């Protein structure tokens, strides 16, 4: 069934699984028309499909052309998501296909279930966790490839950089969700934290700065401060 705080370590066992997040698939700006009406203009989007054990991120870029001439785009976006995840599974060798796919929003369950009827053994599951993957577009290098795309495109990343050389995937996921939760609550402060010290750089083949173990403890504590704070500034406490 659903995924929650009680079966949390299942994410790091040896059964291949993928999270799918569709919150950045259909993206728009809203603006006024010359006549003083409101209209939307879509911008490029992305499906965020992540192996939480290995860090492999399958970033499928959703080019605005896929919306041209279409109606009910927010509903289509869920089915376009399910179509692309199905295509990805089919493209993988059998021993690499996931045994479970966990959607971050329950609205994706039926679209994905229907697109995956051919895989009756792949479990499609929801989750009670409030994961912060919507903040993926606050990672500069992911935002850059999405915005520059002129056609549909899949790009592969490791969202954990080289962290698994030093820490476990349980800890790597905890760090990732803490970074992303911070970027979501206050993007400016979050980024200021990550990049303040100009002597810690991001390697060309990485997404995050090359922090030492000790520097990560400092970073992590600063991100928790930010999240409690904003939660005060938000809730006045």
């Amino acid at each position: 069934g659903a995924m929650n705080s009680s079966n949390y370590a299942e994410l790091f066992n040896n059964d291949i699984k993928l999270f799918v997040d569709d919150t950045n698939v259909y993206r728009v700006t809203v603006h006024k028309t010359f006549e003083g009406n409101v209209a939307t203009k879509a911008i490029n989007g992305c499906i965020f499909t992540l192996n939480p054990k290995t860090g492999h991120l399958f970033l499928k870029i959703i080019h605005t052309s896929v919306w041209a001439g279409q109606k009910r785009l927010s509903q289509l976006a869920k089915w376009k998501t399910a179509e692309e995840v199905s295509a990805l599974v089919r493209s993988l060798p059998k021993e690499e296909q996931p045994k479970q796919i966990i959607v971050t929003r329950k609205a994706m369950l039926d679209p994905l279930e229907v697109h995956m009827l051919d895989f009756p053994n792949i479990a499609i599951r929801p989750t009670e966790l409030r994961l912060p993957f919507s903040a993926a577009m606050s990672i500069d290098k992911l935002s850059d490839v999405v915005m520059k795309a002129t056609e549909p495109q899949m790009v592969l990343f490791n969202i954990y950089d080289d962290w698994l050389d030093r820490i476990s995937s349980y800890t790597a996921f905890s760090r990732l969700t803490l970074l992303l939760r911070a970027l979501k609550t206050n993007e400016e402060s979050a980024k200021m934290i990550l990049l303040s010290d100009p002597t810690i750089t991001i390697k060309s083949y990485h997404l995050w700065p090359s922090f030492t173990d000790e520097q990560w403890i400092t970073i992590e504590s600063q991100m928790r401060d930010l999240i409690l704070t904003e939660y005060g500034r938000k809730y006045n406490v």
């Binding site: 289509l76 089915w79 179509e83 039926d110 279930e113 229907v114 697109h115 009827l117 051919d118």
Partner: protein
């Protein structure tokens, strides 16, 4: 007119005949039901006074033979049997009529209820759903499961209803996933109507046959089947105009006939609200929507 005689009534029982019902006391001198309209299927059903558990009964058509009821004290129920000796059967029936030990099928002459509930039900087609080829009549009871319920355990005692599943490869054409799931016309018209039922008469017949099993025996899988068959039509954008008009009439009489006090369990809130207010056919079921709103506005 035809007659279903009873050898006797050794146990206290409520007897149903179509939408009518009457109480028979233990060892009361009851020898059957007369004046049954020829030309319609019929169902004769039973609920023991001592065990309201297990409603059970027999679908039959008088044109297909001389049938009677006889209590079996080993198996503990009223059984339908066929008498092959025609002279023996007229002789028995005539003697019981002369002594006036039979109840009369009590049809008001204005009343088309039973016809309206059974328009497309067929006895030969029914024999395929409740498989028992050695008898011309068919037994059903409250506990019998459906083939799809068995997929989700005795197949000889199962209700072989047409299996409808909206998230199945049968329902969904590769490459039309979103289209076919949101507009089920392909599944309704090509898969089900053209290529399995063969025509809408067979489709309405099973839908009619499902409902009656749900109402008269509280058979849960039948209720599931009735609602599924409604939902498939309601969730199709492209339905023949004549089918919509007939469906409205079919459902209207089913809703009219349902016991007011069984609504909580025989009606699925989600399917009905979908069908009457959200679906493609929300504005196509005028009679059904009107009786539903005036009789069960709580469900909506």
């Amino acid at each position: 007119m035809n007659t279903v005689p009873f050898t006797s009534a050794p146990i206290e029982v409520t007897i149903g005949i179509d939408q009518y019902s009457f109480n028979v006391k233990e060892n009361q001198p009851f020898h059957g039901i007369k004046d049954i309209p020829i030309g319609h299927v019929h169902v004769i059903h039973f609920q023991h006074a001592d065990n309201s558990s297990m409603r059970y009964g027999y679908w039959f058509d008088c044109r297909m033979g001389n049938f009677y009821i006889q209590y079996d004290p080993k198996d503990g129920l009223y059984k339908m049997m066929e008498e092959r000796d025609g002279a023996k059967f007229e002789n028995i029936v005539h003697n019981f009529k002369e002594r006036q030990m039979m109840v009369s099928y009590p049809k008001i002459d204005e009343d088309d209820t039973w016809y309206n509930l059974t328009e497309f039900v067929q006895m030969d087609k029914i024999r395929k759903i409740v498989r028992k080829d050695e008898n011309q009549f068919s037994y059903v009871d409250s506990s019998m499961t459906t083939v799809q319920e068995n997929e989700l355990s005795d197949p000889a005692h199962s209700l072989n209803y047409t299996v409808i599943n909206f998230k199945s490869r049968e329902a969904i054409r590769p490459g039309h996933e979103m289209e076919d799931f949101l507009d089920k016309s392909y599944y309704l018209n090509t898969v089900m109507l053209q290529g399995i039922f063969k025509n809408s008469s067979n489709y309405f017949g099973e839908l009619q046959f499902a409902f009656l099993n749900a109402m008269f025996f509280g058979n849960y899988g039948s209720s599931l089947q009735w609602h599924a068959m409604i939902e498939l039509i309601c969730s199709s954008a492209t339905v023949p105009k004549h089918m919509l008009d007939k469906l409205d009439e079919i459902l209207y009489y089913q809703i009219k006939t349902l016991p007011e006090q069984y609504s909580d369990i025989l009606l699925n809130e989600r399917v009905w609200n979908i069908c009457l207010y959200s679906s493609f056919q929300k504005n196509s079921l005028h009679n059904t929507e009107k009786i539903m709103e005036n009789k069960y506005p709580e469900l909506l």
